[PDB]
Swiss-Prot record, chains A, B:
InterPro entries: Archaeal_histone_HMF, CBFA_NFYB_domain, Histone-fold, HmfB-like
Site positions for Interaction with DNA: K13
Subunit organization: Homodimer and heterodimer of HmfA and HmfB. Heterodimers may be formed primarily when cells enter stationary growth. Dimers then assemble into higher oligomers, with the DNA wrapped around the protein core. Higher order oligomerization of these structures can give rise to long, superhelical fibers (in vitro).
Protein name: DNA-binding protein HMf-2
């Protein structure tokens, strides 16, 4: 796992939760990590079809549209 | 912003990118943060319709299904 748990716990508290189980924080961190990886994988293929090696913000923005 | 950028950069490198612009890392961190907040907001309403104050892993798992 790359994402730290603490910041994910703050997101859920920030959205209005009174109490958050430790298992809720870990579940959302793993779901967002898996989303990040699938978006990143699609952004890499977009950059390669554009002839580039550098992943740019427009690749991320176009890749997220396949998941919406 | 709650999520740190560095770990998001590692996710994109881990998925296979050779080089990542700083703007790509920031864009994906903001998209995952916004997803985390919308999931968390829906999980809070599920827990309240179940009569609970504590957000649990099953609330997260049911809330992500509205976005798939
Ligand atoms: Cl998926
Ligand atoms: Cl949205
Ligand atoms: Zn996946
Ligand atoms: Zn939203």
């Amino acid at each position: 796992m790359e994402l730290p748990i603490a910041p994910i716990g703050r997101i859920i508290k920030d959205a209005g939760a009174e109490r958050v189980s430790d298992d809720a924080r870990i579940t959302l961190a793993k779901i967002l990590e898996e989303m990040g990886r699938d978006i990143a994988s699609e952004a890499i293929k977009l950059a390669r079809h554009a002839g580039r090696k550098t992943i740019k913000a427009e690749d991320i923005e176009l890749a997220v549209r396949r998941f919406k």
